[PDB]
Amino acid sequence: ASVKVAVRVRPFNSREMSRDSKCIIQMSGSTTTIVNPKQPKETPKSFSFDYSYWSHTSPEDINYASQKQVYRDIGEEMLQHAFEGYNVCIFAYGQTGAGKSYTMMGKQEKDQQGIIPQLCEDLFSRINDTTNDNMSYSVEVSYMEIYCERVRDLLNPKNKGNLRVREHPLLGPYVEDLSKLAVTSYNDIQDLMDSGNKPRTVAATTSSRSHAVFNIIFTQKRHDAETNITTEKVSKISLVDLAGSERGANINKSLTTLGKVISALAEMDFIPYRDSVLTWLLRENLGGNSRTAMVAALSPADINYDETLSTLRYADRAKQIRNTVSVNH
Ligand SMILES: Nc1ncnc2c1ncn2[C@@H]1O[C@H](COP(=O)(O)OP(=O)(O)NP(=O)(O)O)[C@@H](O)[C@H]1O
Ligand SMILES: [Mg+2]
């Protein structure tokens, strides 16, 4: 199962309009072409991707990609693998201010919800539409923050101590004492989501330097009538919103390493998964038993050409990543 990759271009931001920025990003079909505003006559660079989201204009535009449409595409696709029993992972990557959070979390207001809110709703909606009484479900959630290789339990602010990332001798990495709460309804998991988004530390001492990881352990129990054993079907849903690649540093280790892992996997001995908390935890999502997808946010502005071309190249490498996947039953 190769890593699926989507790119999404947002509208101009205040910094760009103030510089009379021109749009150097062009989308057609599954192709994305970027123009070099420095070398206009150089041949433009095109990239092929599984999903191309043109969100530079507005919803009044027939060719605009909305939150809903982005979700209903790669969002339902991954949620369905989850239902199939696969571990799943969707992570947003890109330049600081490119639109990673808008894509993953969006705005809790009218029409603006991102992939995480929409997936949670869909997940509960589907569970509640189950008509087979032999099927029962359990949804547990965890939300954390990674900043300077330090882990914070976003579902438990009261705790001011950063959690320890460990390696279970047989079950893989995991954050110690990370809250894992059970929720029986969309509203509950949404109130937990809002609570977590408020606890997040983006203060002002500027732009996001931390990564957020939203984990849902979705368990499907099937009851067999004749003998009383209950087969469990488990799938972990990891929704990641990283810090912008932006434009001794322990504030950026995870990001730099993430790029190395991505490239070394695309090249495929040995990978620095352990060089950073971010790559250590998501090890299995990167090169392991997981259905993984990347969503690459991109500025449409000429002033961000290097940053955006950089993104497109890492987005391109990810596509080359292949993971051995097996349903968990
Ligand atoms: N598709 C979109 N439509 C409308 N506004 C958008 C869209 N994508 C991003 N934005 C806005 O542009 C800014 C970038 O948002 P997000 O907040 O999405 O950035 P990152 O998450 O790109 N930033 P950072 O964490 O600092 O690297 C925000 O003010 C968003 O409201
Ligand atoms: Mg952000």
The bound ligand whose nearest atom lies closest to the alpha carbon of 14 is 1
- Catalytic, 244? Answer yes
CB < 8 Å & 24+ apart, contacts of 167-171: 167/280
Which residue from 8, 10, 308 has its CB within 8 A of the most atoms of ligand 1, so it is best to mutate?
Answer: 10
Distance CA 269, CA 318 (A): 18
Distances in Å between the Cα of 93 and the Cα atoms of 114, 149, 211, 259 are: 15, 18, 10, 10
- 223 phi, psi to nearest 5 deg: -95, 125
The strand pair at 88-93 and 291-298 is best described as parallel
Considering the candidates 51, 53, 93, 102, report the single residue annotated as catalytic: 102
How many CB atoms sit inside 10 A of residue 189's CB? 24
Look up residue 238 and give its two tokens: 């990891």
Let me know if 97 is a catalytic residue. yes
Token pair listed for 140: 């547990």
Q: What number of helices (H) and strands (E) belong to the chain?
A: 10, 14
Q: Which residues contact 12 (CB under 8 A, 6 or more apart)?
A: 21, 23, 56, 300, 301
DSSP for 95-147, please give it.
Answer: STTSSHHHHHTB-SSTT-B-HHHHHHHHHHHHHHT---TTEEEEEEEEEEEES
**Structure tokens that stand for 248 in this block:** 């001794």
Q: Which amino acid is at 311?
A: T
Name the residue type at position 217.
I
Q: Is 111 left (phi over 0), alpha (psi -120 to 50) or beta?
A: left
What letter represents residue 247's amino acid?
Answer: R
Residue 267 token pair: 């090249």
Contact 297/53 with Cβ under 8 angstroms? no
- CB of 207 closer than 6 angstroms to any ligand 1 atom: yes
By CB atoms closer than 10 A (0-12, 13-18, 19+), residue 278 is buried
- 58 close to 73: Cβ distance less than 8 angstroms: no
Amino acid at 130: T
Question: Which of the following is catalytic: 21, 52, 55, 101?
Answer: 101
172 is catalytic: no
The residue nearest atom 10 of ligand 1, judged by CA position, is 99
CA triplet 18, 24, 295: central angle to 5 degrees? 100
Expressed in angstroms and rounded, the spacing between residue 100 Cα and the centre of ligand 2 is: 5
Enumerate domains of the chain plus CATH numbers: 1-329 (3.40.850.10)
Resolution in units of Å? 2.3
Structure tokens at 275: 């060089």
Which tokens belong to 286? 């990167």
Cβ within 8 Å of residue 205, ≥6 positions away: none
- Nearest ligand 1 atom to alpha carbon 92: 21
Q: What is the DSSP letter of 243?
A: P
